[PDB]
Amino acid sequence: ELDADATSGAFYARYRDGYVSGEPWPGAGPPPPGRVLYGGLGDSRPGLWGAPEAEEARRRFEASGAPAAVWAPELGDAAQQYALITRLLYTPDAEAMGWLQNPRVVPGDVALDQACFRISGAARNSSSFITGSVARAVPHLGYAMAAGRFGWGLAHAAAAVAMSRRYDRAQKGFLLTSLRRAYAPLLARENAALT
Amino acid sequence: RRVELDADATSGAFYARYRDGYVSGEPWPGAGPPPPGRVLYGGLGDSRPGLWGAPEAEEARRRFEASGAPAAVWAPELGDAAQQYALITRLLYTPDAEAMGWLQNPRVVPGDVALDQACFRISGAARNSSSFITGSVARAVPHLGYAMAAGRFGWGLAHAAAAVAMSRRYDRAQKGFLLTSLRRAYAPLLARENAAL
DNA sequence: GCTCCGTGTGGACGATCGG
DNA sequence: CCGATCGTCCACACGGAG
Ligand SMILES: [Cl-]
Ligand SMILES: [Mg+2]
């Protein structure tokens, strides 16, 4: 169906949901002890704390001041990576969409990524596995779902567009501007309430 | 490059001051209507000849016009892109509609196949691999160039939600969370954009 | 006239899933 | 048989130097 209540815009101005920002999404929570979020909702993989791959990447992440090209929960708090990627999506000339799809990766970034899916249970990286993040730089969606932070959905939506092969460079730039306009008031209102 | 976090962005005040140099309702830089007798197709500025007279286009147009629902496989020959955008946008806000599942796994009838094959034949034969730019990640969603030509950023919701729906990295509950995130973000934008235009 | 660089695009082909 | 995403590799433009 389609009414004049929709084409005029009044149906969207009255949008309300039963969820509360800052409250856990139904079924979402922290991973079991000694494990980190991975895969589908509620799933997890063993952590790689003390492993050479995780610790080498943790030091590089803490020393760069930039968002990590390959992120894992062993590297730090997901809120830091979410905020760095979110800010990156709003800085002009940053090439955020190109960086989300094809970031420059040192061998340590490759070794970290290979260790995470291997310790989960995978023999090789495969396009069919549900990981909870379409781009390796974006933290697992379960951390946004557990914290009830809908503004962290922007990182995943922008990365899903960036990772798609069906849009060219100029088309992705328009979609990034669309997402900037949509999420800017949400992020401003959400970051104020939870600070 | 490098990103500097600070209290201006952590408190949210950097996002409250967001402004861009674009104007809603005005063409995106480099974007415009297709040439006469052609429809938008492929990358930015590209186009293919229209099929407004072919039997495949007319069969699908009647099915679209007789259902009152958005077409599962859409082409410019079926009607106004703005109407299909509005139907998909309304569908994305409809409870119990299974919108993400429908975007990812639509029913494709023989008439849809004949329409889709007629569109690629009237263009050039580029396919020899699976990597090709279409301008829309889901066939039900009109070409992005129509949103770019009209400067309608609210029509980006249909493409952003469809890109999530087609991704293989999220399960059903994760895609449901992302739809709610996109609903909240775009609801004030759509309300404000539909009023001005 | 060839290469040499880094870097930024899209294509090619396969793995895996599924109608 | 068809085709979807996405890992992985690669083709090519960029241009002042030899
Ligand atoms: Cl709320
Ligand atoms: Mg066949």
Residue numbers in the entry:
A (entry chain C): 292 to 486
B (entry chain D): 289 to 485
Quote the authors verbatim.
The IE gene product, infected cell protein 4 (ICP4) is a transcriptional regulator with a prominent role within this cascade. ICP4 can induce the expression of E and L genes, while conversely it can act as a repressor notably of itself and also other IE genes. ICP4 homo-dimerization is mediated by the DBD, this region interacts preferentially with a bi-partite and asymmetric DNA consensus sequence RTCGTCnnYnYSG (where R is a purine, Y is a pyrimidine, S is a C or G and n is any base). Here we present the crystal structure of the functionally essential ICP4 DNA binding domain in complex with a segment from its own promoter, revealing a novel homo-dimeric fold.
The combination of the ICP4 DBD, residues 258–487 (ICP4N) with a 19mer DNA duplex matching the consensus site from the ICP4 promoter (IE3_19mer), resulted in the formation of a stoichiometric complex, which can be readily separated by gel filtration. The most complete molecular assembly was present in the ICP4N·IE3_19mer data and comprised protein chains C, D and J with DNA chains G and H which were chosen as the reference ICP4 DBD structure unless stated otherwise. Superposition of chains C and D, which together form a homo-dimer from the same molecular assembly indicated that the individual ICP4N polypeptide chains adopt the same overall fold with a backbone RMSD of 1.15 Å for aa301–484. The crystal structure data indicated that the globular region of the ICP4N homo-dimer contacts the upstream base pairs 1–13 of the IE3_19mer DNA duplex. The IE3_19mer DNA is bound across one edge of the ICP4N dimer interface and the upstream region is partially enveloped by complementary structural features of the protein. The protein residues which contact the DNA are mainly clustered within two regions in both protein chains: first the S-loop (aa411–431) and second the short loop connecting helix α6 to α7, which contains an arginine pair (R456, R457) and therefore we have called aa454–459 the ‘R-turn’. The S-loop forms intermolecular contacts with the R-turn of their dimeric partner; the same loops of different monomers adopt a different conformation depending on their location within the major or minor DNA groove. A dipeptide of F283-T284 (chain J) was also observed in contact with the DNA, notably the aromatic sidechain of F283 intercalates within a kink between base-pairs 14 and 15, where the minor groove width is widened between the bases correspond to YS in the consensus sequence. Therefore these data were indicative of a link between DNA within the YnYSG downstream segment and aa258–289 of ICP4, a predicted IDR. Away from the globular domain, with the exception of a DNA intercalating dipeptide F283 and T284, residues 258–286 were absent from the electron density; this region was shown by solution NMR data to be intrinsically disordered, but involved in DNA binding.
